[PDB]
Design an enzyme around this catalytic site. Structure first.
Site, PDB file in Angstrom:
ATOM      1  N   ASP A   1       3.572  10.289  -7.639  1.00 30.28           N
ATOM      2  CA  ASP A   1       4.572  11.170  -8.221  1.00 30.28           C
ATOM      3  C   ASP A   1       4.440  11.123  -9.743  1.00 30.28           C
ATOM      4  OD1 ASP A   1       7.016  12.809  -8.409  1.00 30.28           O
ATOM      5  OD2 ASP A   1       7.503  12.051  -6.396  1.00 30.28           O
TER       6      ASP A   1
ATOM      7  N   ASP B   1       0.838  -1.201   0.000  1.00 30.35           N
ATOM      8  CA  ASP B   1       0.000   0.000   0.000  1.00 30.35           C
ATOM      9  C   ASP B   1       0.875   1.253   0.000  1.00 30.35           C
ATOM     10  OD1 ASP B   1      -2.105   1.809   0.359  1.00 30.35           O
ATOM     11  OD2 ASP B   1      -2.653   1.067   2.362  1.00 30.35           O
TER      12      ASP B   1
ATOM     13  N   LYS C   1       0.805   3.738  -2.291  1.00 32.17           N
ATOM     14  CA  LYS C   1       0.139   4.958  -2.733  1.00 32.17           C
ATOM     15  C   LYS C   1       1.078   5.834  -3.570  1.00 32.17           C
ATOM     16  CE  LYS C   1      -3.546   5.189   0.728  1.00 32.17           C
ATOM     17  NZ  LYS C   1      -3.317   3.981   1.554  1.00 32.17           N
TER      18      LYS C   1
END
Ligand code: PRO
Ligand code: PRO
Ligand code: PRO
Ligand code: PRO
Ligand code: PRO
Ligand code: PRO
Lengths: 258, 258
Positions: B95, B90, B92
């Site tokens: 960028d 996880d 996330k």
């Protein structure tokens, strides 16, 4: 009634990290943040040492360092103190508050122990800031909120950007400014840092888009340029850094005026 | 014309990672993802071993592990193969594309080498997916896009959620579904995974909000519940996992109907 960086460093509501940054920007005549996008600790440290006098800030992605250790970060701090620049870990925290506090303080990177600044996305709501603050306020750190992005198809626009500004205003004990493409807050206590910057036009093949220092500092009203490949891929990274520093600094002076 | 998990595993456009997951969900009668929110490798591995038979997936935050090594992840893979569950980091990712590819493949975590699934925020635009795909497609991995969040003040709503769905549709060779609070796509090839789940009502003091398994699987149409503190903070984590598994599985059966 725009103030110089040195005067902004004295504003009543200024955050201490922002004040330190603004003072060294004025002292050194630099509003350049180097994006030290390398995978080797030795290259990171050699860039930090050589380019330190030219920069106000060194931005890291420690999760790309193949040979990260906490000792590398101790060496980086030595260079930051010597040459007078802040360390910004571009971690883009973007989880619920309870998770980001652990990602900031703990794990193998211990980001809060060495990063003056971190950044966060605002998409989770203000709990992302509240969680980071729990760690960062006691450690006298600052945070930047991502209000706009430079990449193609960015959703950080319109009401999203406005929500980022409101979230920063309401957490000014910890939030010192923004990652944005332009000035997004009218409050001079907030720093605006802008990535997606090169001297030449264009982009990359994965959605990056470039604007020049003159455009983003002079016309769009940002404070600091964040420059990666425009410096890192050049042969002489010192001369490249100086070209970017001079560009951003003059654009700032011209905007500031008489 | 809702299909069982086992039938969805055979759909023409199914991604191989999704198919593997759906098959083991059907075989084991579990649609529970354990959020293994611990800081010790030994606790991670002991939970994975004991709870492995009860879960379809184990979700990690490797950047919170105080004693991460790649060998820990080798041991986790052994347990995932034995007990038949997928590993979801996880992370996330959030960028620009050129950066996330390096954060996925490289650094000290080498996430792509051990994670079946990762997730990404859609705020940067589709370059985030294109960058991850460069690494993940050759490694036969999958990705989940964060279409909604459970936390107070989430900005992943409205047109943002719609953009996430469109981005997934258009990158179906790599994107296998969503993190969401409800069904957001009508295409049955996509998995819906929902965090913010506990048996009891409430939340935390940093913006987390809870809904029950019956609400999110049965009424909101999600596929899998992601459960952290509801299990991890219980004394008997095995019995807690079984209560969550039974809740989510029955809710699925009831929705599926005759
Ligand atoms: O976009 C342009 O035309 C100019 C050329 C250098 C950077 N900006
Ligand atoms: O657009 C390009 O591809 C080159 C590299 C960045 C600036 N111009
Ligand atoms: O001269 C002054 O006082 C202001 C600040 C520097 C440029 N103009
Ligand atoms: O919100 C409620 O009222 C019920 C109680 C248990 C979980 N959901
Ligand atoms: O809301 C609370 O604080 C407790 C803990 C989660 C479920 N109920
Ligand atoms: O009986 C059937 O064929 C479908 C699938 C399981 C429940 N209803």
């Amino acid at each position: 009634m725009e103030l110089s960086f040195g005067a902004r460093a004295e504003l009543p509501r200024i955050h201490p990290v922002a004040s330190k940054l603004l003072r060294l920007m004025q002292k050194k005549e630099t509003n350049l943040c180097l994006s030290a996008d390398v995978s080797l600790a030795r290259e990171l440290l050699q860039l930090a040492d050589a380019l330190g006098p030219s920069i106000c800030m060194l931005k890291t992605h420690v999760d790309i360092l193949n040979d990260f250790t906490l000792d590398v970060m101790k060496e980086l701090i030595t260079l930051a103190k010597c040459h007078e620049f802040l360390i910004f870990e571009d971690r883009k925290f973007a989880d619920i508050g309870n998770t980001v506090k652990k990602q900031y303080e703990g794990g193998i990177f211990k980001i809060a122990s060495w990063a003056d600044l971190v950044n966060a996305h605002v998409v989770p709501g203000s709990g992302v800031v509240k969680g980071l603050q729990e760690v960062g306020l006691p450690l006298h750190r600052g945070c930047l909120l991502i209000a706009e992005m430079s990449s193609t198809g960015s959703l950080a626009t319109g009401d999203y950007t406005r929500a980022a500004v409101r979230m920063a205003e309401e957490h000014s004990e910890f939030v010192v400014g923004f990652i944005s493409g332009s000035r997004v807050s009218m409050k001079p206590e907030f720093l605006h840092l802008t990535p997606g910057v090169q001297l030449e036009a264009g982009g990359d093949n994965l959605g990056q888009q470039y604007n020049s220092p003159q455009e983003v500092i002079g016309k769009r009203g940002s404070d600091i340029i964040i420059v990666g490949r425009g410096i890192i891929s050049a042969a002489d990274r010192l001369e490249a850094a100086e070209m970017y520093r001079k560009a951003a600094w003059e654009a700032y002076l011209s905007r500031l005026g008489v």
